Symmetry: C2
Subunit: 179 residues, 2 copies
């Protein structure tokens, strides 16, 4: 109808902060919303799409922030470690996997999720480096490598990836920007 | 039966080097093999799984190699640029997306594909750095960042990612390992 959609969105959101990601399939959502799964497909092509779409509604409060002190190495190491910690929690890791999964289903969905989740992280790192008069090309390349280190590692090896590897990758990258 | 499986594997493999990835759905495979899609599910849970499984059969000839000169910066920049080039071709990019997609479906599948595709790349970079007496922790962190830069960027922004950004990320990382 017009409220059936809302019920699915609300069922998904409640199921998220109650059973987490592991117990959040289309069936659970459909049963909690009270609808046939094809009613869900009137609005989302897939479970990943539906979950990512709800998470996207919240990108702001999901994405955290860059320390800003007189020590750029400490700032980026702190940032990278906090990110690594966040994405290796059980919830954080399942979230990353869900967002990547949804992204790979449609190029438009990937673009939407990149704008929501990846862009603020790249821009935070890039801006912090430009603050120190690093040029645009090196700031971009360094940001690709620091965010890339963390995201790729968590996607590849999962929750055993550590705050410590992330921080070490950050210190190496920043040292390579000297002066 | 026992040859129906072979026919699907052979249909997939031929369809790969004839129509590429964009024209390779379960339907095309089923029609070329002559089977019902549920016969395919006797052996693979999904289209991504089936495609990744065939690609995995070939990991060796898929994965390329590390230059070994007296210039570690040139070697890693060459390696990273070649990798970036390979993953931003139309076929290379669709392959990366398919492997990541399959990986996210089952933790065992991810582990199998990581062993097949990611491990040789990480180890190639790590080994090249240990060659220069970089310790194990920094060699790992630098490898995470160089491979991570490329893979994460191609997954996020697709085929517009360039050889040049990859090479710049490599030179920055290696410079951060001095001495």
């Amino acid at each position: 109808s017009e409220k059936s959609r809302v019920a699915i969105v609300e069922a998904t959101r409640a199921l998220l902060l109650e059973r987490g990601f592991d117990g959040l399939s289309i069936e659970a959502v459909a049963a909690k919303a009270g609808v046939g799964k094809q009613t869900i497909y009137r609005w989302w092509p897939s479970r990943h799409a539906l979950v990512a779409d709800v998470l996207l509604e919240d990108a702001d409060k999901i994405l955290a922030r860059m320390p800003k002190t007189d020590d750029v190495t400490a700032d980026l190491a702190s940032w990278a470690g906090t990110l690594a910690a966040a994405l290796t929690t059980r919830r954080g890791h399942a979230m990353l996997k869900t967002l990547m999964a949804a992204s790979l289903e449609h190029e438009d969905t990937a673009a939407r999720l990149r704008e929501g989740f990846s862009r603020p992280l790249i821009e935070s790192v890039r801006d912090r480096l430009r603050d120190e008069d690093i040029d645009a090309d090196h700031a971009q390349a360094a940001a690709d490598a620091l965010l890339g280190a963390v995201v790729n590692a968590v996607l590849s090896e999962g929750r055993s990836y550590s705050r410590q590897r992330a921080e070490t990758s950050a210190r190496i990258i920043v040292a390579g920007l000297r002066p």
